[PDB]
Amino acid sequence: NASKLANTNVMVVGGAGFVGSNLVKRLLELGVNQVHVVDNLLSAEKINVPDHPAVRFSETSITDDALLASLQDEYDYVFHLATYHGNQSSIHDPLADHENNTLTTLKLYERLKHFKRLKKVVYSAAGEETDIVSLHNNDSPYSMSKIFGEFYSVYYHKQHQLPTVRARFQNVYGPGEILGAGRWRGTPATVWRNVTPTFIYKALKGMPLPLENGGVATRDFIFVEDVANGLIACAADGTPGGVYNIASGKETSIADLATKINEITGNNTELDRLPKRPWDNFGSPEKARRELGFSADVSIDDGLRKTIEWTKANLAVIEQIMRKHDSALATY
Amino acid sequence: NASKLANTNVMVVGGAGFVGSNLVKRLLELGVNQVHVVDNLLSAEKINVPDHPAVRFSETSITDDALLASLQDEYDYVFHLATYHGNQSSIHDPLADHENNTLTTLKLYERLKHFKRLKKVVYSAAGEETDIVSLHNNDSPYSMSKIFGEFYSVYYHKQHQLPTVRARFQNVYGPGEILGAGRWRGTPATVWRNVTPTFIYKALKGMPLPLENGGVATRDFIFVEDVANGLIACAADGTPGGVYNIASGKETSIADLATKINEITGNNTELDRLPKRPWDNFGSPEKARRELGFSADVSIDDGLRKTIEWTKANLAVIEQIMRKHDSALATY
Numbered sequence: 222n223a224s225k226l227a228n229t230n231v232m233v234v235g236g237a238g239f240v241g242s243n244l245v246k247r248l249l250e251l252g253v254n255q256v257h258v259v260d261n262l263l264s265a266e267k268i269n270v271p272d273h274p275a276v277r278f279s280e281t282s283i284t285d286d287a288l289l290a291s292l293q294d295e296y297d298y299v300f301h302l303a304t305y306h307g308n309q310s311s312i313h314d315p316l317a318d319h320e321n322n323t324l325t326t327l328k329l330y331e332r333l334k335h336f337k338r339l340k341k342v343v344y345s346a347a348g349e350e351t352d353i354v355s356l357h358n359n360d361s362p363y364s365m366s367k368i369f370g371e372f373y374s375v376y377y378h379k380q381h382q383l384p385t386v387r388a389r390f391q392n393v394y395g396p397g398e399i400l401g402a403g404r405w406r407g408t409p410a411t412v413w414r415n416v417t418p419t420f421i422y423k424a425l426k427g428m429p430l431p432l433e434n435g436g437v438a439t440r441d442f443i444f445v446e447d448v449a450n451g452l453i454a455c456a457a458d459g460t461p462g463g464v465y466n467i468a469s470g471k472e473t474s475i476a477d478l479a480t481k482i483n484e485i486t487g488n489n490t491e492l493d494r495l496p497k498r499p500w501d502n503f504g505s506p507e508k509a510r511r512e513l514g515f516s517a518d519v520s521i522d523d524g525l526r527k528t529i530e531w532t533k534a535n536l537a538v539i540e541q542i543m544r545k546h547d548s549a550l551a552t553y
Numbered sequence: 554n555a556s557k558l559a560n561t562n563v564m565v566v567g568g569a570g571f572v573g574s575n576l577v578k579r580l581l582e583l584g585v586n587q588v589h590v591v592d593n594l595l596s597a598e599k600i601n602v603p604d605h606p607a608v609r610f611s612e613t614s615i616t617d618d619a620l621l622a623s624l625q626d627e628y629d630y631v632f633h634l635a636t637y638h639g640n641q642s643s644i645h646d647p648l649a650d651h652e653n654n655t656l657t658t659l660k661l662y663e664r665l666k667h668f669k670r671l672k673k674v675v676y677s678a679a680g681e682e683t684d685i686v687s688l689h690n691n692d693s694p695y696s697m698s699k700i701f702g703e704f705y706s707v708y709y710h711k712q713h714q715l716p717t718v719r720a721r722f723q724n725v726y727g728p729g730e731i732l733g734a735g736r737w738r739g740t741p742a743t744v745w746r747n748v749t750p751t752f753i754y755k756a757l758k759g760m761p762l763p764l765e766n767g768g769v770a771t772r773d774f775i776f777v778e779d780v781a782n783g784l785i786a787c788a789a790d791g792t793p794g795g796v797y798n799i800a801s802g803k804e805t806s807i808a809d810l811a812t813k814i815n816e817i818t819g820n821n822t823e824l825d826r827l828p829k830r831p832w833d834n835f836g837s838p839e840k841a842r843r844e845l846g847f848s849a850d851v852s853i854d855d856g857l858r859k860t861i862e863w864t865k866a867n868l869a870v871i872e873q874i875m876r877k878h879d880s881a882l883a884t885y
């Protein structure tokens with residue numbers, strides 16, 4: 222990254238969220254002058270937004286015309302992390318997705334296009350790096366919104382010199398991701414938002430972890446603190462118009478993820494495991510390493526321990542948050 | 554195409570426009586039961602929408618929630634031709650483009666997704682056929698909106714079986730395209746909307762045609778009546794989820810276009826021409842021929858004659874329409 226960020230003014234759109242909150246904490250620790258958090262708490266909890274003399278919090282949508290018109294050219298860096306969480310919610314309501322996942326990026330970039338203090342605008346794009354995409358195998362409106370944000374990022378850079386850097390990451394896990402965070406977004410995935418926190422929660426309650434299909438599917442998990450540092454490196458040193466995978470380069474099967482969670486938590490229950498076959502089943506981190514000196518080196522073992530310790534410490538709070546969706550969960 | 558369209562109920566979004574109006578006239582002549590024209594007249598004139606017992610006209614945006622909620626499952630075919638006209642206007646105001654070029658397709662498809670009477674939804678996509686696209690060399694928000702409409706067309710077909718067919722065409726010319734049609738959209742291109750009507754207008758006024766760079770650039774022009782028939786063929790016989798170039802397969806240089814316009818009109822003024830060089834400079838029509846039996850066979854010579862005859866007959870009306878933008882044109 223850098224202390225290029227020291228004493229700077231930063232906006233984090235979506236900064237009350239999982240990746241966002243973690244980014245905000247890291248920015249504060251790097252000595253930034255200001256974080257302007259813009260977040261509508263659609264998929265977040267206000268407890269993730271510090272009450273801090275340096276942290277200004279606008280509890281508004283980044284699509285709000287008044288808010289946009291009120292923005293001043295007083296930012297060195299903008300991190301655009303807002304999204305409509307996530308695939309399942311977006312399928313359920315593509316219009317809610319569009320408002321909070323496509324229009325967000327367009328109206329934000331439209332406001333920022335003539336700002337001159339901006340050094341970098343870092344857009345969380347989802348998951349060497351190529352800039353060719355298929356109309357097919359976009360499984361959700363969410364996936365289309367994310368890709369549309371990359372189209373916008375490239376356009377605004379070429380047309381208006383908006384200094385955009387697209388940061389592609391996926392399968393982020395760690396402290397600050399709260400099952401049930403924010404409003405009901407249509408489906409049980411509002412609760413059960415990703416495999417890692419679902420597994421950690423269930424394991425801490427001594428419950429059998431539900432392995433789907435023997436858990437043969439693999440993912441390149443990345444610890445959230447590495448993602449924060451990756452985003453910061455993109456800001457500091459990322460080439461305007463450019464794109465970087467922020468990735469661990471290491472794949473872990475869901476069976477193995479489950480196994481590790483159970484052993485750390487001491488959850489002594491059965492795992493419906495199966496051997497991975499060739500027909501059962503990722504981005505290279507080399508560009509970010511070479512160009513930004515960035516490496517995501519937190520192992521799945523270290524990362525799971527830190528996540529579990531945080532979950533344990535905050536279990537009551539998380540449980541109380543989850544419970545707000547009990548009646549919608551029963552209706553589904 | 555077919556008389557598969559005989560006695561059917563059809564909606565034409567954007568049906569007061571250039572391609573739209575021509576499509577509506579051809580539908581009426583093929584004996585359709587109903588055309589529901591939905592058009593906000595943003596880049597169109599109401600004189601292009603017939604007052605007809607069979608033609609219902611909603612002078613509303615297709616994004617209007619009330620209108621969308623009011624739509625009944627009473628359509629056999631939908632043609633989605635609305636756009637924010639065009640590249641230049643979209644650069645000027647990407648937000649106006651988005652509203653009338655991206656959100657249009659999404660909210661339309663969202664309403665139509667559970668309609669069961671629908672045989673085909675034909676989307677005008679702009680310009681064998683591949684479904685791979687680059688984030689680069691999208692010159693405008695318009696170009697991004699058009700591509701986003703293809704993402705949506707593919708998604709809605711795969712997810713909801715919406716029977717979409719993407720019709721890719723460009724450089725359409727002919728009767729019904731009126732210089733200055735609709736509202737001021739920010740730039741002189743509101744008047745001077747395309748090279749062909751600009752040239753025909755100027756030539757009829759005995760003015761030198763402004764050839765840019767000796768006119769070496771070439772385009773595959775297509776007569777609007779061939780485009781209408783191409784759209785109808787897509788509706789009748791196009792494969793759901795699929796895409797077709799609707800194209801002439803013949804390239805004409807702007808110098809040659811200018812030359813032909815001058816000779817038909819008898820405009821006896823100079824042309825700043827240059828020889829085309831290899832470094833100075835299109836979609837195949839074969840898929841549509843093979844699969845739909847569709848061929849765009851109107852030559853540039855025949856098409857220009859028909860267009861010029863229409864322009865001549867309607868010159869006063871067109872001039873009066875153009876004049877509404879005099880004060881915005883002077884301000885630009």
Ligand SMILES: NC(=O)c1ccc[n+]([C@@H]2O[C@H](COP(=O)([O-])OP(=O)(O)OC[C@H]3O[C@@H](n4cnc5c(N)ncnc54)[C@H](O)[C@@H]3O)[C@@H](O)[C@H]2O)c1
Pocket residue numbers: 234235236237238239240241259260261262263264265281282283284301302303304305306320321325345346347348367390391392393394403
């Ligand atoms: N977590 C992952 O593995 C993952 C993977 C790939 C990409 N991403 C991307 O990373 C970014 C952050 O995701 P996250 O996991 O922190 O999820 P998240 O839901 O916790 O964070 C998104 C934040 O955006 C906010 N938001 C939603 N609509 C808004 C609007 N209109 N205006 C302002 N804020 C709004 C939410 O309230 C939330 O705080 C997103 O862009 C996402 O697409 C995440």
Ligand SMILES: NC(=O)c1ccc[n+]([C@@H]2O[C@H](COP(=O)([O-])OP(=O)(O)OC[C@H]3O[C@@H](n4cnc5c(N)ncnc54)[C@H](O)[C@@H]3O)[C@@H](O)[C@H]2O)c1
Pocket residue numbers: 566567568569570571572573591592593594595596597613614615616633634635636637638652653657677678679680699722723724725726735
């Ligand atoms: N003319 C060409 O060479 C060309 C080339 C490639 C693609 N296309 C595509 O063909 C289609 C028709 O283009 P055209 O040349 O007839 O231009 P056009 O401007 O004449 O027609 C577009 C129509 O859409 C209407 N419209 C705009 N916003 C609307 C909204 N929100 N709701 C309903 N209607 C709305 C306009 O009022 C207009 O009648 C468009 O999709 C365009 O992108 C045209």
Ligand SMILES: O=c1ccn([C@@H]2O[C@H](COP(=O)(O)OP(=O)(O)O)[C@@H](O)[C@H]2O)c(=O)[nH]1
Pocket residue numbers: 308392415416419431432433434436438440475
């Ligand atoms: O309760 C769960 C939740 C998910 N998974 C698996 O964990 C993986 C999660 O993948 P990812 O987070 O990348 O998103 P997804 O692929 O599901 O869209 C998938 O293989 C799921 O089958 C599981 O076994 N049990």
Ligand SMILES: O=c1ccn([C@@H]2O[C@H](COP(=O)(O)OP(=O)(O)O)[C@@H](O)[C@H]2O)c(=O)[nH]1
Pocket residue numbers: 640724747748751763764765766768770772807
């Ligand atoms: O008054 C004009 C208008 C345009 N043109 C040329 O005609 C072509 C029009 O191209 P097209 O319609 O496909 O759209 P464009 O390429 O301009 O975006 C371009 O080469 C222009 O330089 C011209 O010579 N004189």
